[PDB]
Amino acid sequence: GDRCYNCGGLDHHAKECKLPPQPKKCHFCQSISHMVASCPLK
Amino acid sequence: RLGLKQAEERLERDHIFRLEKRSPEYTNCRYLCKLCLIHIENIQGAHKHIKEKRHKKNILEKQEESELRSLPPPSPAHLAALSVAVIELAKEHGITDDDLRVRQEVEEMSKVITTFLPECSLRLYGSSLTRFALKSSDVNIDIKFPPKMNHPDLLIKVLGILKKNVLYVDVESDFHAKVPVVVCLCRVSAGNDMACLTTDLLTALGKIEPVFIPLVLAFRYWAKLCYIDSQTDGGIPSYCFALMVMFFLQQRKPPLLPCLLGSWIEGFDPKRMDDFQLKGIVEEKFVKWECLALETPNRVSLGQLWLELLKFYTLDFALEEYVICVRIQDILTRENKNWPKRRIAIEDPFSVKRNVARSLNSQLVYEYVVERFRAAYRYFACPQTKGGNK
RNA sequence: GGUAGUAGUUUGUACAGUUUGAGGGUCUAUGAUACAACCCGGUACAGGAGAUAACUGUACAGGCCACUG
Ligand SMILES: [Zn+2]
Ligand SMILES: [Zn+2]
């Protein structure tokens, strides 16, 4: 129901997530430069 | 790349730091915990460590310590109220010179024994001699005798009289202590050679520093409240609490007590002072330096001294890191003397072979001591009626 | 007298992982549909890694019962 904390993927949760930590991505614009709360075009 | 830091940024809020370079003892591990002292190898392992019960149980204690550090400075009125409160507490429950004179008037019991035994070994010892408690440590008269005679037979013969007379009540003899003892509350333990050498120093400090007695008295009363004073059933030796205070005064930025050794010495080698030996006081002067008053008097409000002591033993330094010693003002590591790290390390100047305090091995008792120290610090520092004192 | 070690049986803490009972949504919804499958969805999220008890072996501090080089 919620995106993975480590990878931002609904496929698996953080506990099940096995891939190494990677830069966060803004869901609204799919950009790692900024987060969702700081999206310029939102 | 840059975002990876954000992933560990959360961990930075739980005092989790990635190792700058690989550690030889844990080559695989790449992380460390400031509070838990445990190495980790992966970020998932770090998050699991965050979920550990002990990690949060220590994080809450760290937060409480930070809150204590941020307490506002005391006001002059609060300081004066606290000082008068400590003075009242010390004077109400303090053995005065009259009580010591009454106790001395030991002489009658010595006269009684001398009739039975031509050579009688009786000498006043304990709280009354030091005036540092009220029948708390080494209550009444704890005797010392030379080793040239045989202590067991002496103990038997002397206890024979105290058991013989029916006037006395509840007279027994216990040999379970480090030295044989007889209770009638009298204490007869022949063979002591160093205890008197230490009570000599404690008595010497009684009038050399007027604030020494009230501070040690307040510490003893607080320990009695907390039950830490009792050597039996764990805790910390009762009399060594006084030595504990002597450590604070000696390690205080403005010292109130001269150093026993190192104040005047030739060929000082701080690597090991085992060879150096001390002797009895000489007219309240520095202890024997062959092989105790400051040049300028120090007088400060007792409340300030109490607050500084509480900060020293609660918020200043880690108790396990260093040993409590009075021989040298320089701080000494515990591993240098090969002493254990589980038991609180307290060292009396005249004997360094073994730790005087070995009843605090249980970590539960140490945690109780630490939490009581924190509670006392917050109770006293925070403003309250009558200076926040009992 | 000092260092170190020593069969089980005991000591208090922490603990890879393995199993009950309590946990968190529930209101945001038309309809289906003998025991013949599937469901429209305005009114949801923030930067957040999510539980207590009986077993399983374990680094620590001294001993039971006292011993050994
Ligand atoms: Zn994932
Ligand atoms: Zn965006």
Author numbering:
A (entry chain B): 136 to 177
B (entry chain A): 274 to 378, 380 to 458, 466 to 572, 619 to 717
Paper text:
Tumor-suppressor let-7 pre-microRNAs (miRNAs) are regulated by terminal uridylyltransferases TUT7 and TUT4 that either promote let-7 maturation by adding a single uridine nucleotide to the pre-miRNA 3′ end or mark them for degradation by the addition of multiple uridines. Oligo-uridylation is increased in cells by enhanced TUT7/4 expression and especially by the RNA-binding pluripotency factor LIN28A. TUT4 and TUT7 are multidomain enzymes whose specific targeting of RNAs makes use of three zinc fingers, combined with two copies of a nucleotidyltransferase domain (NTD), one inactive in the N-terminal half of the polypeptide (pseudo-NTD) and one active in the C-terminal half.
To compare with TUT7, a truncated TUT4 (residues 254–1315) with a similar activity to the full-length TUT4 protein and to an N-terminal-only truncated form (residues 153–1649) was expressed and purified from the E. coli KRX strain and assembled with LIN28A and pre-let-7g before polishing by size-exclusion chromatography. A 3.68 Å cryo-EM structure was obtained for the TUT4/LIN28A/pre-let-7 in the pre-oligo-uridylation capture state found also as TUT7 ternary conformation I. This structure enabled us to identify more clearly the interactions between the LIM module of TUT4, LIN28A and the pre-let-7. Although the CM of TUT4 is not well defined in the 3D map, density apparently derived from it can be visualized in two-dimensional (2D) class averages of the complex, roughly oriented in the same view compared to the TUT4 ternary complex in conformation I, in line with this being a capture state before CM engagement with the open end of the pre-let-7g. Together with the TUT7 ternary complexes this structure therefore provides a demonstration that TUT4 interacts directly with LIN28A, a currently unresolved and key question in the field. The pre-let-7g is observed bound to three main interfaces in the TUT4 capture complex, which we have termed interface 1, interface 2 and interface 3, respectively. The side chains of four positively charged residues R283, R286, H320 and K324 from the LIM participate in the interaction with G51, A52, G53 and A54 of the pre-let-7g.
